[PDB]
Amino acid sequence: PYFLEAYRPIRKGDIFLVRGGMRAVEFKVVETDPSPYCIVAPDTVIHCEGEPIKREDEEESLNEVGYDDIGGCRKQLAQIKEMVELPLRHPALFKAIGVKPPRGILLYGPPGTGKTLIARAVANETGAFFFLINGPEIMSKLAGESESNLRKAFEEAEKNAPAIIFIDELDAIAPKREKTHGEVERRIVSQLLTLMDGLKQRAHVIVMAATNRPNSIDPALRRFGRFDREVDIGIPDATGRLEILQIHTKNMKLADDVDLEQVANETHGHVGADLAALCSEAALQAIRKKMDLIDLEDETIDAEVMNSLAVTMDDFRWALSQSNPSALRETVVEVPQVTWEDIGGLEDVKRELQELVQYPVEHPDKFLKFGMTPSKGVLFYGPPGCGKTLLAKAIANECQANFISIKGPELLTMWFGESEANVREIFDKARQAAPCVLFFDELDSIAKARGGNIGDGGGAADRVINQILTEMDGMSTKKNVFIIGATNRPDIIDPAILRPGRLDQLIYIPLPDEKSRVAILKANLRKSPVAKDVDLEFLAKMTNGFSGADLTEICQRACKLAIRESIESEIRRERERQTNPSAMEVEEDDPVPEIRRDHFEEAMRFARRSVSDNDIRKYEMFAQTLQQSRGFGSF
Amino acid sequence: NRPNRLIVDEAINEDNSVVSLSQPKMDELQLFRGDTVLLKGKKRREAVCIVLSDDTCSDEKIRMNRVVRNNLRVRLGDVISIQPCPDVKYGKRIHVLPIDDTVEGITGNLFEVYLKPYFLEAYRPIRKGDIFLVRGGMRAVEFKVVETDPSPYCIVAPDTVIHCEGEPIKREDEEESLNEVGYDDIGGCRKQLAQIKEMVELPLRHPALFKAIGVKPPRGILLYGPPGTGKTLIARAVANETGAFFFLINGPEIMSKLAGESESNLRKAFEEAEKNAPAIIFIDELDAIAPKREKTHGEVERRIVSQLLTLMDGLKQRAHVIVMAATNRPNSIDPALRRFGRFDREVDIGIPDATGRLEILQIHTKNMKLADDVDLEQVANETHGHVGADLAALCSEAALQAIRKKMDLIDLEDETIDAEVMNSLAVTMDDFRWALSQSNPSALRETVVEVPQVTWEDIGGLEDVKRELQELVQYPVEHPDKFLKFGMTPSKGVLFYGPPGCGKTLLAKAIANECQANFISIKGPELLTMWFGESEANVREIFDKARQAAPCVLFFDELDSIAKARGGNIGDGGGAADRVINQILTEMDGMSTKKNVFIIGATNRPDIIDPAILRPGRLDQLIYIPLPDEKSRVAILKANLRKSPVAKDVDLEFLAKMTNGFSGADLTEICQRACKLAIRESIESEIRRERERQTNPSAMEVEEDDPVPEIRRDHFEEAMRFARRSVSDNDIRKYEMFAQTLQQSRGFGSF
Ligand SMILES: Nc1ncnc2c1ncn2[C@@H]1O[C@H](COP(=O)(O)OP(=O)(O)OP(O)(O)=S)[C@@H](O)[C@H]1O
Ligand SMILES: Nc1ncnc2c1ncn2[C@@H]1O[C@H](COP(=O)(O)OP(=O)(O)OP(O)(O)=S)[C@@H](O)[C@H]1O
Ligand SMILES: Nc1ncnc2c1ncn2[C@@H]1O[C@H](COP(=O)(O)OP(=O)(O)O)[C@@H](O)[C@H]1O
Ligand SMILES: Nc1ncnc2c1ncn2[C@@H]1O[C@H](COP(=O)(O)OP(=O)(O)O)[C@@H](O)[C@H]1O
Ligand SMILES: [Mg+2]
Ligand SMILES: [Mg+2]
């Protein structure tokens, strides 16, 4: 199947790569009659006899790692190429400039995200001499044999300039100073510091290192001249996970029903090593389904027997059901997928959010010329279930920015177990991934947990909103990090937040009106196969005083009734079929393929209003007494 | 090619000379349940057996004992050709010899004890070249058929004579011993043993065939569990039953050496297991070698940990080496030993259940000779909290009591021991009773993860509740495709509420039994212990136990306990979220949808609960369980009284009819008080009859009879006088008002 419907122009002196049969194989065009090059025709004959030969001493292998084996981290790989490719490809041309290069790069991320892979791929695809230092290999030696190996490493990478030194697991060699007990460990740390200072007198040596988090490193290794540049390699997103699954299934031969996009959409919390383990485990189940024709050919393996091996979707289903990911506890920094069309109405709110978020990014020159400091925060308020998280995700999607979400229990965990460095780590994550929208859901949670209208005593500032205020005041204006908070109880919030410079804009989001609920129901029902409705506009018209969560509840109850009836029909037909064996008319049909009006007409009987009229009266009174106006024309 | 080619499966029928086949294979070969077939194996050796039938057998496999399996030079997963042999020849002379390492305590006669009930009513087809195993007399012994006159094979007849004279000989250099451990010695952990076989058997039995695939194997497995659950046993059994070279590393043996002699022994271990690929390295007690980094003080311990890390990374350049390790809990290991490429797979070997404990007691009592009244099922039902080593100690301790009851005929035969004297030794049920009364188990503090035994018939009525729980729990497991097609996210939690004693724990156990899922129960004091002694990692460890044993039902009894302990309607201040329900909320939000872990809570005070739990996505379904009605109480009383021998009732329906406003606990109280009155009267009658009997000695009419064998209506008519209502009408009024104001309806037909 390689030359068929291909017409490949080959030439004597070419090596090509054929994948398939869970194996990649390299062939070399040894002899052709139309020398040097020819297009392969059906007239051709291919004499594939002969003995396999070895490799030429200069021909590099396609088994080793290039940029193709890396998926899901295109931006960080581009950033590392921009840092490193110019002092390696042009050493002497950069020597005559007068610009200092970087001399230490610190990769960090969770375990399994492929940092050794990125280091080796940037090594091999530039021709630089790559030396590897492994942490436990040095720390497993004797007292005086560790420093000699470090000195041999740096002195050997001197002579092959340009070179790359990759120190793997820097947490093992040089941890925090309080975690070092002894004198040998401190001599190793001081030896590494001395060599990293000695790089400045050297020429064309780049030192890379890889950790698991920044805060486990001796902070003397982070100053200027020693690992000043830091790269963050986070967990992948859905496009990234699809790219990982496409990389690891190159050689394997999938069946026809296998759709990798649904598998990539299902895996949440999986780093790349988990996806490699998932692919290998599903392939082992596909082998262990048939150990009948495999075992009888024991001595040799033919490729057609493994061509009979094809992995199905049930293999990936079982591999999803068995595997447990490792990055569930980590925070998710990614672009949302909610667009404006999932939200019904609220048009002036969309206009105001586009004025606040998007105009300082697209047109900075107008704010420079007119001389205005841009605002930095927004507080939404309103009844529960009225779509505040959806507006935050939608405005993070319109500007193509990242999105970090912080719930109420993550604030109450900081409240009960008294810990406040985590608030600083949050704003660090928000600054390393700028531009982003940082969303604080339920700011009133601590002020509600401490008391009602009357707390323990004096319901002013608490411990955690205090650190939020200090970090907002310490915020740089150039980074474009935009902070949104959300409440349901606007009257018990700390008034020091609403002072100009912290969160000055207030937006009230009301219950959705008669036109919005149609766009709510169409957005909720877009996956369930509904059919043959008479008047969905009447369904939105009869419901008055209903938030979005209530309409979602109605749709979920209708789906419940549909699934129950479609299981009862299958049970009854199977019972009546098996009661009279050898059923003469086997004519298969789906009894309930779509959801009809009977299900909605039954499920509307269980509908309820979540918000009373006293609460609506309170939000209307806060909105009235918030607004004061002069209304007088000065001219 | 040929339909007689078969692969070896495990043994179920515990007879030695019995193989098994499936029904369509025997109908394809046209056999019978009394035939005699022949099996060809490796090294040009065969074995004759008796074929029977089995319905649990697979398609192209055969089930046989370890004796027949070792007599063919065959391991698990090999190939065997079967052929019929109608050559039914009766034997004439059978010359057998014992083996010296299994007779080194017994002497004198062996024909009457071991062999005389062995061939009687057996008709065993034997052959020259067979070794068979006889158990009995607290000893297992191996005999070898040395000479027969109908060569090669013959069926043993009563016409035969057996010349059991001669000297015991040694073992052939290649004949493996039946003293060593196989899969038969392991009981109670069938699922974990099957999982380890699925992980390990394919990279060992087919090394080069797996080498040419392109799939990486596992390269480190971490067994963990409480002490005494048999982890070294499982490692050694998976070692010996695959033919892999097994090297043992013991933790204190390395940590007891000098400063520079430990790393050399580790290097010798890994380098020696290189040369014998495929090999298995078992590192026992990994807590001793590589503990947590804060618990290592010194430099030698950290050099040993870094040496182990370097070798485990060096396995990736090696070929066909599997490293197993065994701990007591995961959280005592340096977390660098758990990343990818170093012990990525973890197996949990928990404490056994009742079927498991029965299987342990059947394994350890193979050689011992029990009496007639000994029922191992009641002993297995009684032992709770016992790991397998406790059960082995229980069996040995009861056998020592049975020996120390009679030290009269034992002691006088001091020089030699005859087997008939130990055949007089028989263990009774009183021995196991005393051994139960003396022993103290070690796993009482551990949590119990097991399938419940309560069915739907222990619960009276509540039919729509049963229907709703089957809709919520069971339909996303049996029919995932309907939820995929209609596009619905399944719900995840349920909150029961109602009066106390109305059967919420029974419904939770019953729905865990209907779906055949595990069940983890968490009481109110286990939440208040986390409240007073401020500790919140235990909530994360609970959900870890719930995810490692999926599918399961996780039951939080008394969610209102902390909100009741902190205050009434008015707490200390602002009765919102507390510390522990907060961690429950974060762990519920961090829950994967594919695992099918189903969470149930239960309260009695629905109005003081945290309202952040009832938000969609955490616990959205609410179910009210009322006081049982007039029809339910009959099924309550029949379920309670099913063990007590009641008799001759007139109207049990009247007994359920007169009691109005009574929960299930009150009816259970009535039944227990009736049993109290019955036991008191049946002891008073025995005391009075013994006193009147002894007052007039030499009683002429000794005619034994039970005065009160059954419970009569007088006991119930007396015990009903002490009955009381536990729930007042104000509480019922409050639950009815919460149920009314919870429900709102439109009731309008849209069409
Ligand atoms: N982004 C990725 N693209 C492709 N394969 C990946 C990726 N990330 C991980 N893998 C696979 O998973 C393996 C593990 O990668 P590693 O380099 O070991 O990750 P790691 O960061 O080194 O983990 P630690 O902390 O060193 S144990 C790689 O060898 C690949 O086979
Ligand atoms: N599941 C079991 N089946 C049969 N016998 C068992 C079982 N578990 C334990 N035993 C018996 O109890 C003994 C103790 O087993 P061990 O392998 O020592 O358990 P363990 O896990 O090694 O305990 P530690 O932590 O190493 S002290 C075994 O040698 C058996 O005699
Ligand atoms: N305006 C809206 N239009 C459509 N669906 C909505 C709207 N508001 C809420 N929803 C629905 O309710 C849920 C989102 O609620 P959300 O806005 O996050 O609530 P809250 O403001 O209380 O945090 C989703 O099921 C979403 O589809
Ligand atoms: N509906 C019932 N049917 C049968 N027995 C019941 C019923 N309700 C309670 N019981 C019995 O009374 C007790 C109820 O315990 P449990 O269900 O845990 O009570 P609660 O729900 O009040 O916590 C048990 O002894 C149980 O067997
Ligand atoms: Mg690495
Ligand atoms: Mg052990």
Numbering used by the authors:
A (entry chain B): 137 to 771
B (entry chain A): 21 to 771
Quote the study on this structure.
Using the same dataset, we determined five structures of p97 in total: three SH conformations (I, II, and III), and two DH conformations (I and II). The nucleotides are well resolved in both p97 SH and DH.
